Design a protein around this ligand. Structure first.
Ligand SMILES: *[C@@H]1O[C@H](CO)[C@@H](O)[C@H](O)[C@H]1NC(C)=O
Ligand SMILES: *[C@@H]1O[C@H](CO)[C@@H](O)[C@H](O)[C@H]1NC(C)=O
Ligand SMILES: *[C@@H]1O[C@H](CO)[C@@H](O)[C@H](O)[C@H]1NC(C)=O
Ligand SMILES: *[C@@H]1O[C@H](CO)[C@@H](O)[C@H](O)[C@H]1NC(C)=O
Ligand SMILES: [Ca+2]
Ligand SMILES: [Ca+2]
Ligand SMILES: [Ca+2]
Ligand SMILES: [Ca+2]
Ligand SMILES: [Ca+2]
Ligand SMILES: [Ca+2]
Ligand SMILES: [Ca+2]
Ligand SMILES: [Ca+2]
Ligand SMILES: [Ca+2]
Lengths: 41, 507, 259, 272, 265
């Protein structure tokens, strides 16, 4: 068994807000292709 | 975009899937049966040479949850101990040289098989597990047929079968060979012991090897299994003569404004094969089916040959292929009225400039693919074996003649596969002698544009429907915005050209 | 749709003495009460009494029920105002709480096919309610690849028993795992039901001990609503006279359904 | 800490302490023997672990500490976990016992030993009680007067002492605060401690599996409160109780908060 | 009085050193000694406790602030040591065969461990840091370990045949086990007569004071074989009698209590 999706949403609510803005805007300018997106996770 | 789909087909050519990892979870009713082999020595009939077990096949048909399932079960034993009982050295005393008995140390094997899908092509399995319930198996009453004397009867004996590991096996026979599942069971002796009556043997445990079935028709135990196996994705393993006419009937019924609205969308593989209400097999293998034929055509071969000739023109230079080059020097983008001939020959590679991402405008192959996607969602006659090589005949025979242009310091040089060339100024449309050996040097490296708005209609428009500087620059640049604005302003000098493009997109 | 208003408007007249005339009332009393009373015209008597409060004679109904469990077995409450009288029994605490959880709340119920499908609960209000003469339910959770956890999908003995010989059951299990079930489908029918907004049309009245009903399956609220009332008793005529006299309070605590 | 703290109402701060520990929680259930008796299974602990895994708790975080009886559990309850849940069955003949257990585990106590013979003790405030634990504690108390004599009792005849505990394992005795008492206890089998009640223990949660709320945690009869971490259930089986607890453990965990004073294993601090 | 939180503290460098809290901390605190049975055996006196109390009374410590708590043996003391006082002293005899146990005792009492429980029948446990150890108490603990690989299979051991497990303890009353941090271990333990607890070593306990009576200092508190430190409250003496030792302790009880410091937790 993996999770209850309600509790996984609560894990998101634990990762609510704390993304930096310079870092987010620099992260959203990358071609995060399949390899990069499913390797590091 | 609509040519990017062709470029993507070419890119994913290496994929030209078939297998799959499927999960099966089904209930089953294991109705098995034992079998004994009673061998009787010669003499009078008081002496028994052996009483052993035998592999016991049983084939039957039972009712699942709304299914009528045919099945086949093969029982066997392993590690049974051998006991003996001698009453004397005479032919007239009841003696059993050897009889087999069951205890903890032994094991019971059961090969199980059905006619369902889980067993049709089971050759590879992993993550195998199973939930089985325990039962009790007891021996009956085997009366030793003594010609004369008393009647010894082997009676009693019970054992509790507890589940154990599962594996694979193969049931062989003189008729059929079945790739089956091997259910293994461990044993624990029960309270009722086995005993032969009118004989000095009693209060001993196990299961008698004489009549283990107890006169029953089978021993029924339910179970469930789960696995992950390999299976062909196609779940079955264990006649253009009229198509062209359908295309030419569907050609002009299609509209123009909405078609131009649709010819700007990157209708990638999903979007191109989603609106097709395909068959269960086509939806699984459509893309690879069309690709294995798309990389067989004049288009693909010409692309690969241009690439081979560019490689060979970069390498050969010391022995440089001197076939011909008008312009600066050999490029293989310009390889050859003489002027009209050269221009047509260069335009038969400007089609490759088009489907090489080195264009700026409506990129005629894009219009061709839009017509394709607008026709193959309407045409009733579309099928898995049918779309392959229709996509290619489309890509090959849509807009055979097509023109291009290049701009340099406000001077447009046109060209066409139909042997026509036109030089002219942007602001003031007036022809000029066509500057060959400069048009080539420019079209080679500078970007090219397509002739959707070609000079003839352009001049007719600049004459009748007087045109502004920005509108004319955008029409030279082949802008879909101004194109659709004219198409909504209902300009027949553009509607006619678009209708001509449709009628050339005929197949 | 949206609704506007204002605070400058005035309060309207009392809808009482008209809601009585254009509504119906339905009492649900136990056979014990009729027994202790031992009279044939007590219904006519109570209706003539209600007629003083304003409820006309052809508006009040009395619907006897032999036992709380027999009542919990498919209670067909179809009236514009329902009152229930409920005895207290420690041995029947969970049953008389499930009855409340069933009638006080309005349930959106779908059927269930155990033998053919396996089900799971999505939110905290998607429960499994079984009704019948004698229910005996057992549950086996499963994992991602349809294998049992402390149970066997085939061996019914290895299942976990949650109900035994219960006429009504309300089962909440862990929300996010697929369960297999074993139920006496012959004698009990089971539905998967999501709890909608409460039923403001029924009023439970506990005739005996302290307030024990815990509607909320979550053991943190334990709320006591407006239409879950209590009385201490030594006779039944006193209870019925109390109900009669304070019916207006009960009908102010209740509100006609919206559906 | 004495220093102050500041704040605001517009900000969205997001800046907070981050660190590591044992793996982000632990949980310990205290269930009666009767539950496993009714269940009659030897895989139900692992079943509940894999269930909790859906709610987020990893493998090595959930624990069960079976207890035979409420009194046996009251005898030296050693709680060392980051979250504690206590299922407790209802018995009208044990109300005082399972209210003393509640007042003991829910609240935080600071205890000093006591020497009955050599000294005579007294209470100062309404929170300085005398808790006695053991196997059979029979207590008797004689108040005294200003001149070190007795009041309705005699310093010599223990029979004249007034009895307050008979055949109890845990006793929590509150007497008149401001007078010297003389005590007689079965010191061989029980130990008595002068304890003072402090701020509550937010790490435990009681769950009355049965009847209505009766626990009067506050010895004064005027409050009769009921805390957030004092739950009730109606039960006919134990599997359904445990499934309920598991489906609603996030509310239990939102109602419980880790300790503040310190780490400790017993139900009270010792300060001599 | 903000408990449960940690705030920046502040001060200055112009404030003068305040008065001596000595002669008041002795009065409002308590001192508990832990001596061995051999001491009272050699002594053979019934009033030695009242004697040492009247001696402390000269140093300032009042009569009923001092406590003596005997223990027959270092192992019987290691079996669930319950040190609940405001200043604890522990006189410890040296035995080269008991070195490891009396070092585990030191690492257990000198420090303040945050201890969570453990259940071997269900789970398989792994360590996260170098201070998350497993301490086993009881009368005779026989602990065996089988590490597992990435795919839940043993390494040189089988998950059924307990005989193939690796033995680290053999009939020990106290054990403190550290293993490779990052790998799950399956355990065999005599749960009936021993309790194992997974504990994290937090900052030290400044409330106890070990005083070795005999041999050279050997106690390696820190499990890592790089520090081998000698803490401030780790004292040594050389002995031939016990009265001299107690007189030394009493005469230098102020240095001892200066080396100790009332707890934080
Ligand atoms: C021919 O096409 C037009 C539109 O393109 C359509 O309206 C007409 O019905 C078609 N003819 C027949 C016979 O269907
Ligand atoms: C409301 O009550 C007042 C006073 O009793 C009465 O005058 C009025 O007529 C009532 N409203 C209606 C609509 O009759
Ligand atoms: C918290 O972090 C954000 C961004 O990192 C910052 O703007 C904010 O000032 C921080 N909070 C405080 C109290 O400084
Ligand atoms: C601190 O010591 C000095 C010198 O001994 C003394 O004068 C002073 O009074 C002491 N402080 C207090 C508060 O008594
Ligand atoms: Ca639920
Ligand atoms: Ca089970
Ligand atoms: Ca029920
Ligand atoms: Ca008590
Ligand atoms: Ca008296
Ligand atoms: Ca008091
Ligand atoms: Ca040791
Ligand atoms: Ca370590
Ligand atoms: Ca080994």
């Amino acid at each position: 068994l993996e999770r209850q999706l309600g509790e996984l949403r609560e894990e998101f609510n634990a990762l609510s807000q704390e993304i930096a803005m310079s870092q987010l805007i620099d992260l959203a300018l990358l071609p995060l292709d399949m390899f990069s997106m499913f390797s590091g996770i | 975009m609509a040519s990017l789909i062709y470029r993507q087909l070419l890119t994913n050519s290496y994929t030209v899937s078939l297998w799959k990892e499927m999960q099966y979870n089904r209930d089953i009713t294991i109705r098995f049966k034992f079998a004994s082999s009673i061998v009787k020595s010669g003499g009078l009939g008081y002496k028994w040479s052996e009483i052993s077990f035998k592999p016991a096949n049983y084939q039957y048909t039972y009712t699942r949850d709304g299914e009528e399932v045919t099945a086949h079960t093969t029982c066997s034993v392993n590690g049974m101990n051998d006991f003996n009982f001698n009453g004397g050295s005479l032919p007239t005393d009841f003696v059993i040289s050897r009889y087999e008995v069951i205890k903890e140390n032994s094991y019971v094997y059961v090969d199980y098989w059905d006619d369902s899908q889980a067993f049709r092509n089971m050759v590879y399995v992993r993550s195998l597990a199973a939930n089985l319930n325990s039962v009790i198996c007891t021996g009956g009453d085997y009366s030793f047929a003594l010609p004369v004397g008393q009647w010894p009867v082997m009676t009693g004996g019970a054992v509790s079968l507890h589940s154990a590991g599962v594996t694979l096996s193969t049931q062989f026979t003189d008729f059929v060979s079945l790739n089956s599942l091997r259910f293994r069971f461990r044993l624990t002796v029960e309270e009722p012991s086995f005993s032969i009556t009118r004989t000095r043997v009693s209060r001993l445990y196990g299961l008698p090897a004489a009549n283990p079935n107890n006169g029953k028709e089978y021993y029924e135990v339910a179970g469930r299994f789960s696995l992950i196996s390999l299976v062909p994705s196609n779940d079955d393993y264990q006649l253009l003569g009229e198509l062209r006419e359908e295309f030419n009937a569907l050609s002009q019924e299609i509209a123009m404004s909405q078609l131009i609205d649709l010819a700007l969308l990157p209708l990638d593989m999903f979007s191109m094969f989603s609106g097709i209400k395909s068959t269960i097999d086509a939806a699984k293998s459509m893309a690879t089916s069309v690709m294995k034929k798309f990389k067989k055509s004049g288009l693909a071969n010409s692309v690969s040959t241009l690439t081979d000739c560019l490689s060979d023109a970069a390498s050969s230079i010391s022995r440089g292929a001197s076939i011909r080059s008008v312009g600066s020097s050999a490029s293989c983008w310009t390889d050859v009225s003489s002027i009209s001939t050269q221009t047509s020959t260069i335009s038969r590679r400007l089609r490759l400039k088009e489907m090489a991402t080195q264009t700026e405008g409506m990129n005629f192959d894009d219009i061709s693919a839009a017509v394709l996607k607008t026709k193959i969602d309407r045409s009733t006659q579309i099928s898995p074996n049918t779309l392959p090589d229709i996509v290619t005949e489309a890509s090959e025979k849509f807009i055979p003649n097509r023109a291009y242009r290049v701009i340099n310091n406000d001077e447009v040089f046109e060209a066409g596969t139909d042997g026509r060339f036109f030089a002219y100024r942007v602001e003031t449309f007036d022809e000029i002698p066509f500057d060959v050996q400069k048009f080539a040097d420019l079209v080679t490296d500078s970007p090219v544009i397509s002739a959707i708005i070609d000079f003839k209609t352009l001049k007719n428009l600049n004459d009748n429907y007087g045109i502004s500087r920005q509108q004319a620059f955008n029409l030279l640049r082949s802008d879909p915005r101004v194109l659709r604005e004219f198409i909504n302003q209902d300009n027949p000098i553009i509607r006619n050209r678009i209708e001509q493009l449709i009628m050339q997109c005929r197949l | 749709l949206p609704i506007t208003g204002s605070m400058d408007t005035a309060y309207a007249n009392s809808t009482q003495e008209e809601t009585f005339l254009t509504s119906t009332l339905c009492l649900y009393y136990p056979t014990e009460a009729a027994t202790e009373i031992n009279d044939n015209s007590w219904k006519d008597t109570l209706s003539q009494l209600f007629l003083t409060k304003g409820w006309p004679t052809g508006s009040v109904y009395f619907k006897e029920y032999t036992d709380i469990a027999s009542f919990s077995v498919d209670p067909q409450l179809y009236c514009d105002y329902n009152v229930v009288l409920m005895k207290y029994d420690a041995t029947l605490q969970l049953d008389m709480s499930e009855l409340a959880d069933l009638i006080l709340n309005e349930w959106l119920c779908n059927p269930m096919d155990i033998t053919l499908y396996y089900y799971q609960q999505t939110d905290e209000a998607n429960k499994w309610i079984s009704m019948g003469s004698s229910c005996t339910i057992k549950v086996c959770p499963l994992n991602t690849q349809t294998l049992g956890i402390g149970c066997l999908t085939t061996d019914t003995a290895t299942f976990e028993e949650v109900a035994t010989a219960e006429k009504l059951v309300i089962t909440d299990v862990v929300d996010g795992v697929n369960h297999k079930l074993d139920v006496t489908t012959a004698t009990c029918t089971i539905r998967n039901c999501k709890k909608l907004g409460p039923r403001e049309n029924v009023a439970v009245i506990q005739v005996g001990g302290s307030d024990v009903l815990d509607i909320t399956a979550d053991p943190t609220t334990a709320p006591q609503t407006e239409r879950m009332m209590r009385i201490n008793w030594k006779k039944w005529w006193q209870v019925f006279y109390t109900v009669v006299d304070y019916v207006n309070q009960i009908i102010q605590a209740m509100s006609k359904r919206s559906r």
